[PDB]
Amino acid sequence: TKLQVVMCGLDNSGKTTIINQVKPAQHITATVGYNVETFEKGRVAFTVFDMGGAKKFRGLWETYYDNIDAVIFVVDSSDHLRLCVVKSEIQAMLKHEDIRRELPGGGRVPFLFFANKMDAAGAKTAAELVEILDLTTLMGDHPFVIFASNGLKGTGVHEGFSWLQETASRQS
C-alpha cells in the first residue's frame, strides 16, 4: 500500500514537526519551497510533499495536488490573527481541479486537519476552529476530520494518520 499526501498550512504552523513524528527513528528549520518525505510507516509507503507555508511558497502547493490521496492541513490553533488567511487558502485550494476531481471510486479528496499547538497559550480547540473557519460549509462533500495536536510530543498526530490511512484505503 502506497499513499501520496500533500501537506499544507501557513508558515510556523508545525507541518514539518508533525511529519517528523511519523517517520522512522534514525534540527528543524523553516521549509524553503518544499521537501519530499518518502518513508515507510507500518505496512504503508508514504510520499509526502511537505510544503513551505510562507506566502511566497503558497503558489507552489498546487503543483503537488495531482493524483494525491489526501491533504493534511496544519493550523496553529494559537495564531488567531491569521485564521482569516487560513480560510482564504483553504478556499483557494478547494477551487483547484485536482482537489475538486471525483476519485476513481466516486469519492472526494479527504482532508486531515490538525489544530496544532494545543499546548500553546491561547490555543483554540478543534471545535472552536471549525466554527471560526466555517469549515463544514467550506469542505462540503470532502471527507474531513480535525484533531487537536501537539507536534512536539505527537499528541493527536498518530490518531490523525490512522484516520487518513483508513479513509484512503476505503476509497481506493
- Interface residues with Mg ion (CB under 5 A) are 15-16, 31
Q: Which three cell numbers stand for residue 63?
A: 503543483
Which of 60, 85, 92, 120 lies at the binding interface for ligand GNP (CB under 6 A)? 120
Question: Which window, 12-20, 36-44, 82-90, 157-165, contacts ligand GNP (CB under 6 A)?
Answer: 12-20
Which of 9, 48, 71, 160 lies at the binding interface for ligand GNP (CB under 6 A)? 9
Which partner, ligand GNP, Mg ion, none, binds residue 14 by CB below 5 to 8 Å per kind? ligand GNP
Question: Which window, 13-21, 99-107, 130-138, 161-169, contacts ligand GNP (CB under 6 A)?
Answer: 13-21
AA letter at 15: K
Give the C-alpha separation, 157 to 159, whole Å: 6
DSSP state of 108: B
Tell me how far, at minimum, the Cβ of 11 lies from ligand GNP, in Å.
4
Beta-carbon neighbour count of residue 32 at 10 Å? Answer: 10
Q: Is 149 annotated as a binding residue?
A: no
Give the C-alpha separation, 33 to 159, whole Å: 28
Q: Is 117 annotated as a binding residue?
A: yes
Q: Is 14 annotated as a binding residue?
A: yes
Sheet hosting strand 44-51, strand order edge to edge: 34-41, 44-51, 2-8, 70-76, 111-116, 144-148
Check: CB of residue 147 under 8 Å from CB of residue 117: no
What would you measure as the largest C-alpha separation in the chain, in angstroms? 43
Total of residues contacting ligand GNP (CB under 6 A): 22
Nearer to ligand GNP, 31 or 47 (CB): 31
Give first-to-last CA distance, the chain, whole Å.
10
156 binds ligand GNP (CB under 6 A): no
Coil, strand or helix at 116: strand
What part of residues 74-113 is at the interface with ligand GNP (CB under 6 A)?
74
Which of 117, 139, 161, 164 lies at the binding interface for ligand GNP (CB under 6 A)? 117
Q: Which residues are annotated as a binding site for GTP?
A: 9-16, 53, 116-119
